Write a protein that binds this ligand. Structure first.
Ligand SMILES: Cc1cn([C@H]2C[C@H](n3cc(CNC(=O)Nc4cccc(S(N)(=O)=O)c4)nn3)[C@@H](CO)O2)c(=O)[nH]c1=O
Ligand SMILES: [Zn+2]
Length: 258
């Protein structure tokens, strides 16, 4: 009886196995755009993905991860609210059963159809597993998806999903360029938070871009054909794999822009 997104194992249950679910810096949150303060001291984000080396795509039973070689400074995030250098390890998405829901963060209570998380770890801690034990261990770049025009740079991901339909399946996934998933503007909100899935560790500097990317209805429909289940198990569509907004508590969301 493992955690998931069902009635008997979803977000409202997670606190029994993971009591930090009710902690002081949980994610995601609602971004109240009028309460966020412009912080003129925040630096432009530096996204350096030219040498990124994707390796594999994995259905892990809660999402799919596109994994990168993080054994060298090849795809890094720095600047913005960050001190030092954070290396890209994986990206994944959260999405809905319908276009009206699916994001984890919300903006003035608006839910987007999906949310992309580009996960990076602070190189001063040596590896991802040590980084997640630190309050500044991770930097997650969050990007909202809305349904409209297709995102051409997403299609290579969409077209491999048939090969990883079920939990535990992986496929080689080399030469994928994550620059093709970024919006034009790097304007962002930032706040201290957590992983949005168990173990819900309070180790993330969240950087949420204001500008969504557009994907087509056909692209998100292919996300919704994935399965939570393993092969030869009852089919349960991988949809609504998002945690709802958590209390802000004693936190301030800062804006990079006026
Ligand atoms: C000890 C050790 C552990 N590890 C990893 C595996 C282990 N783990 C992974 C999951 C699944 N949960 C997520 O992946 N959550 C998540 C991870 C990153 C971002 C986000 S999100 N949605 O907020 O963007 C969520 N459950 N447990 C995690 C902490 O225990 O550290 C390692 O790589 N090397 C090690 O030496
Ligand atoms: Zn995520």
């Amino acid at each position: 009886h493992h955690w998931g997104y069902g009635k008997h194992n979803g977000p409202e249950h997670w606190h029994k196995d993971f009591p930090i679910a009710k902690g002081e810096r949980q994610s995601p949150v609602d971004i109240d755009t009028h309460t966020a303060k412009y912080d003129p001291s925040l630096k432009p984000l530096s996204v350096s993905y030219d040498q990124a080396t994707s390796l594999r795509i994995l259905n892990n039973g809660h999402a799919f991860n596109v994994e990168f070689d993080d054994s060298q400074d090849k795809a890094v995030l720095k600047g913005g609210p960050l001190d030092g250098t954070y290396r890209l390890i994986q990206f994944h998405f959260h999405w809905g059963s319908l276009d009206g829901q699916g994001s984890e963060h919300t903006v003035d209570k608006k839910k987007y159809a999906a949310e992309l998380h580009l996960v990076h770890w602070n190189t001063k801690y040596g590896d991802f597993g040590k980084a997640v034990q630190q309050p500044d261990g991770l930097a997650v770049l969050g990007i909202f998806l809305k349904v409209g025009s297709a995102k051409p740079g997403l299609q290579k991901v969409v077209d491999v999903l048939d090969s990883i339909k079920t939990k535990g399946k992986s496929a080689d996934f080399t030469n994928f360029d994550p620059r093709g998933l970024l919006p034009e503007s790097l304007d962002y909100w930032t706040y201290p938070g957590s992983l949005t899935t168990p173990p819900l560790l309070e180790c993330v500097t969240w950087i949420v871009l204001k500008e969504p990317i557009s994907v087509s209805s056909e692209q998100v429909l292919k996300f919704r054909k994935l399965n939570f289940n393993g092969e030869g198990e009852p089919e349960e569509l991988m949809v609504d794999n998002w945690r709802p907004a958590q209390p802000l508590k004693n936190r301030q969301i800062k804006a990079s822009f006026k």
